[PDB]
Amino acid sequence: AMKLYIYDHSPYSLKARMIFGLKNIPVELHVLLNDDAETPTRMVGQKQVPILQKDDSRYMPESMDIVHYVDKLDGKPLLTGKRSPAIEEWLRKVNGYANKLLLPRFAKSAFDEFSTPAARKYFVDKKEASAGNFADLLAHSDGLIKNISDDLRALDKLIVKPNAVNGELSEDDIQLFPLLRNLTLVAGINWPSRVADYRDNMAKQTQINLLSSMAI
């Protein structure tokens, strides 16, 4: 009877979703409108998402707390591999700018949490620094796309396996995949073959759709 309250686009929700998919544990997704402060506050006392409702019907926020709690539910935790400092550095870098590519694309996209005009507007009112700034960021796609492409060629030589970035499923797979999955929203990226393998493989494994059809 486990429910998971999420936003489709958010990495933090995706991290929670991965652990259910990877362990083949059935979960009832409930996407909440981006502007909804009242419902998550009933559940956990604050506007926080993702939220997990366990079988006892009690609520629990925080992505990593949820991942750790779920990995444990069947007595066979899967996230046993080592973390790579080379992967953590790469993540640190790309996260310094990926949102310059994603946030504007998010706002324009077909996600449930934006299904209402006011829900979509809130996201923009919360994330867009100045009134037309997303339009200016989109206009600098050319530059950012080169930047991301180059980085993916560096991530390419680092990926040991298509089913575990380090060779054994680890926290790096939790931190990496959401980023990669969401970057498939960005039209024009050049994807190297091993990164591509990993992206496709890890999507079938986590039971999470990729965004290529909505790419802009």
Curated annotation (Swiss-Prot):
GO molecular function: glutathione disulfide oxidoreductase activity
Domain GST N-terminal intervals: 2-78
Disulfide bonds: 10-13
Alphabetical UniProt keywords: Disulfide bond, Electron transport, Redox-active center, Transport
Cellular component terms (Gene Ontology): cytosol
Annotated family: Belongs to the glutaredoxin family.
Record's function text: Involved in reducing some disulfide bonds in a coupled system with glutathione reductase. Does not act as hydrogen donor for ribonucleotide reductase.
Alphabetical list of NCBIfam families matching this protein: GRXB, PRK10387.1
Protein name per the record: Glutaredoxin 2
Gene: grxB
